[PDB]
Amino acid sequence: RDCRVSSFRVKENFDKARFAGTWYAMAKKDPEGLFLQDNIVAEFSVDENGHMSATAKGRVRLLNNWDVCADMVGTFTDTEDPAKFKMKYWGVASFLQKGNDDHWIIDTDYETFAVQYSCRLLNLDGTCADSYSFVFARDPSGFSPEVQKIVRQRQEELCLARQYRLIPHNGYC
Ligand SMILES: CCNC(=O)/C=C(C)/C=C/C=C(C)/C=C/C1=C(C)CCCC1(C)C
């Protein structure tokens, strides 16, 4: 299999606090329009109250050919599903995109990898018309082959197999 968003599995008993820290974007499936290009690094935090938030850094290619290092902020609201959040985001720079997107943690082991996903528009059939997904790593060097195998499985389960591209890290930001 099913490609309906509602049938997708998410991370069981997702732990916000164990998820905190630095996450390096290894690969990504882009959505329609503008997006972060490369050199993406995210820092997740959780306050005493259990409110998760994050800050992201990354290179954005302005429609005008400007390359900017974007500094982004996102706040997450919890839902009835511990692994599915509503994320409000904005940039430090007023010209960076602002919005609200679903943010689901598909899978993670907290120590090595993470698979994230967001459907910004649903088709009439329940499938996703415009999505994005990131594969994160704790270590910028990546994962082992064993983890690589888990990640591929998750990508397939999301109906996004073969749609990701490797993201370069050259500390542009
Ligand atoms: C031209 C304006 N520049 C842009 O077009 C800038 C854009 C899109 C930035 C989009 C940024 C987005 C969605 C960031 C989403 C996410 C975060 C906030 C931080 C947590 C994880 C993230 C999932 C990595």
Curated annotation (Swiss-Prot):
What cellular component terms from Gene Ontology apply here? extracellular space
The protein depicted here goes by the name Retinol-binding protein 4
Q: Which GO terms describe its biological process?
A: retinol transport
Lineage from the top down? Eukaryota, Metazoa, Chordata, Craniata, Vertebrata
UniProt binding sites for substrate: Q97
Q: Which family does it belong to?
A: Belongs to the calycin superfamily. Lipocalin family.
Disulfide cysteine pairs (residue numbers): C3-C159, C69-C173, C119-C128
Query: Quaternary structure per UniProt?
Result: Interacts with TTR. Interaction with TTR prevents its loss by filtration through the kidney glomeruli. Interacts with STRA6.
Identify the PROSITE patterns for this entry: LIPOCALIN
Q: Which UniProt keywords apply?
A: Disulfide bond, Methylation, Retinol-binding, Secreted, Transport, Vitamin A
Task: Identify the tissues in which this protein is expressed.
Answer: Detected in blood plasma (at protein level).
- The chain residues annotated with the modification Omega-N-methylarginine are R120
Under the heading Pfam families, the entry gives: Lipocalin
Where is this gene product found? Answer: Secreted
Q: What is its main location?
A: secreted
